[PDB]
Coordinates of C-alpha atoms in Angstrom, one line a residue:
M1 CA 89.1 119.4 90.1
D2 CA 92.8 119.5 89.1
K3 CA 95.5 117.5 90.8
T4 CA 93.5 114.4 89.6
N5 CA 96.6 112.3 88.9
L6 CA 97.7 113.2 92.5
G7 CA 94.5 112.9 94.4
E8 CA 93.8 109.7 92.4
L9 CA 97.3 108.1 93.0
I10 CA 97.8 109.5 96.5
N11 CA 94.4 108.9 98.1
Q12 CA 95.3 105.2 98.0
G13 CA 99.0 105.9 98.6
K14 CA 98.8 107.3 102.1
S15 CA 96.0 104.9 102.7
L16 CA 98.2 102.0 101.6
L17 CA 101.2 102.7 103.7
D18 CA 98.8 103.5 106.5
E19 CA 96.9 100.2 105.9
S20 CA 100.0 98.1 105.4
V21 CA 102.5 97.2 108.0
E22 CA 106.0 95.9 107.9
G23 CA 105.9 92.4 109.5
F24 CA 107.0 89.2 107.7
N25 CA 104.0 87.6 105.9
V26 CA 100.9 88.2 103.8
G27 CA 99.4 91.5 104.9
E28 CA 102.7 92.8 106.1
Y29 CA 105.9 93.6 104.3
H30 CA 109.5 93.3 105.5
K31 CA 111.1 96.8 105.4
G32 CA 111.8 99.7 103.0
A33 CA 108.2 99.7 101.8
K34 CA 106.7 102.4 104.1
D35 CA 109.2 104.8 102.3
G36 CA 108.8 104.3 98.6
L37 CA 105.0 104.4 98.5
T38 CA 105.3 107.4 100.8
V39 CA 108.3 109.0 99.0
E40 CA 105.9 109.2 96.0
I41 CA 103.4 110.8 98.5
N42 CA 105.9 113.2 100.1
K43 CA 106.6 114.2 96.5
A44 CA 103.0 113.8 95.3
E45 CA 101.0 115.3 98.1
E46 CA 103.3 118.3 97.9
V47 CA 102.0 118.5 94.4
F48 CA 98.4 117.4 95.0
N49 CA 98.0 120.6 97.0
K50 CA 100.6 122.5 95.1
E51 CA 99.8 125.7 93.1
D52 CA 102.2 124.9 90.3
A53 CA 100.7 121.4 90.3
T54 CA 99.6 122.3 86.8
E55 CA 100.9 120.7 83.7
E56 CA 104.5 120.7 85.1
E57 CA 104.2 119.3 88.6
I58 CA 101.3 116.8 88.3
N59 CA 102.9 114.5 85.7
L60 CA 106.2 115.2 87.6
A61 CA 104.5 114.0 90.8
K62 CA 102.5 111.3 89.3
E63 CA 105.6 109.5 88.0
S64 CA 106.5 107.9 91.3
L65 CA 102.8 107.8 92.2
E66 CA 102.1 105.4 89.4
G67 CA 105.3 103.4 90.0
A68 CA 105.8 103.7 93.7
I69 CA 102.3 102.4 94.8
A70 CA 102.6 99.6 92.2
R71 CA 105.8 98.6 94.1
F72 CA 104.6 98.7 97.7
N73 CA 101.4 97.0 96.6
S74 CA 103.5 93.9 96.3
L75 CA 105.7 94.7 99.4
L76 CA 103.5 93.1 102.1
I77 CA 104.4 89.7 100.9
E78 CA 102.1 89.9 97.9
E79 CA 98.9 88.1 98.8
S80 CA 100.1 85.6 96.2
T81 CA 103.9 86.0 96.0
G82 CA 104.3 82.5 97.4
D83 CA 104.6 81.4 93.7
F84 CA 108.3 82.1 93.4
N85 CA 108.9 79.7 90.5
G86 CA 105.9 81.3 88.8
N87 CA 104.5 77.9 88.1
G88 CA 103.0 77.1 91.5
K89 CA 105.4 75.7 94.1
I90 CA 106.2 76.9 97.6
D91 CA 108.9 74.7 99.2
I92 CA 112.1 74.9 97.2
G93 CA 111.6 78.4 95.8
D94 CA 113.2 79.5 99.1
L95 CA 116.2 77.2 98.8
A96 CA 116.5 77.4 95.0
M97 CA 114.5 80.3 93.5
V98 CA 114.7 83.3 95.8
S99 CA 117.8 82.6 97.8
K100 CA 119.5 82.0 94.5
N101 CA 119.9 85.6 93.3
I102 CA 119.3 87.3 96.6
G103 CA 119.8 91.0 96.0
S104 CA 119.0 90.9 92.3
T105 CA 116.8 93.7 90.9
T106 CA 116.2 91.7 87.7
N107 CA 114.3 88.8 89.1
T108 CA 111.6 90.6 91.0
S109 CA 109.0 88.1 89.8
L110 CA 109.5 86.2 93.1
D111 CA 110.3 88.8 95.7
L112 CA 107.6 88.8 98.5
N113 CA 108.5 92.5 98.6
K114 CA 109.4 93.1 95.0
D115 CA 111.9 95.6 96.2
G116 CA 114.2 94.5 93.3
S117 CA 116.5 92.4 95.5
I118 CA 115.9 88.9 96.8
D119 CA 116.6 89.4 100.5
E120 CA 115.0 88.8 103.9
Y121 CA 111.8 90.4 102.8
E122 CA 111.5 87.5 100.3
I123 CA 112.4 84.7 102.8
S124 CA 110.0 85.8 105.6
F125 CA 107.0 84.0 104.1
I126 CA 108.5 80.8 102.8
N127 CA 110.7 80.5 105.9
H128 CA 107.4 80.3 107.8
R129 CA 105.1 78.7 105.2
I130 CA 107.7 75.9 104.8
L131 CA 107.6 74.9 108.5
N132 CA 103.9 75.5 109.1
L133 CA 102.9 73.9 105.8
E134 CA 101.3 70.8 107.3
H135 CA 101.0 68.5 110.3
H136 CA 100.2 65.1 108.9
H137 CA 103.4 63.8 107.3
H138 CA 104.6 65.7 104.2
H139 CA 103.7 67.2 100.8
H140 CA 101.3 70.1 100.5

């Protein structure tokens, strides 16, 4: 069963984008995700079922398949992206960590989306988590 790299990287691909949704919190990404993970598909599926999807197209189509899904996977406000500082703190990372670079493709370690640019996609969660963090007095 050829097209392994494809059928193995795409099966989940079209199932990810079709499972995920652009929203603004855990389980939903901001925007620009539905494309990447699909762009790899549009380019992969065309290979998955391609005839020349031999030794030339597979690896050629798996490239973005192994790097595009890995991206979108952390686009839906990574189930645990809240840890912007990377040490375990969700309160200032929005007004000190993420908002700091905003639009930087070097510090993707704390981008709810991981689109390589601290933008709205990365503020969505905190912006909400901050407000609806507690209802007693303060502190987590």
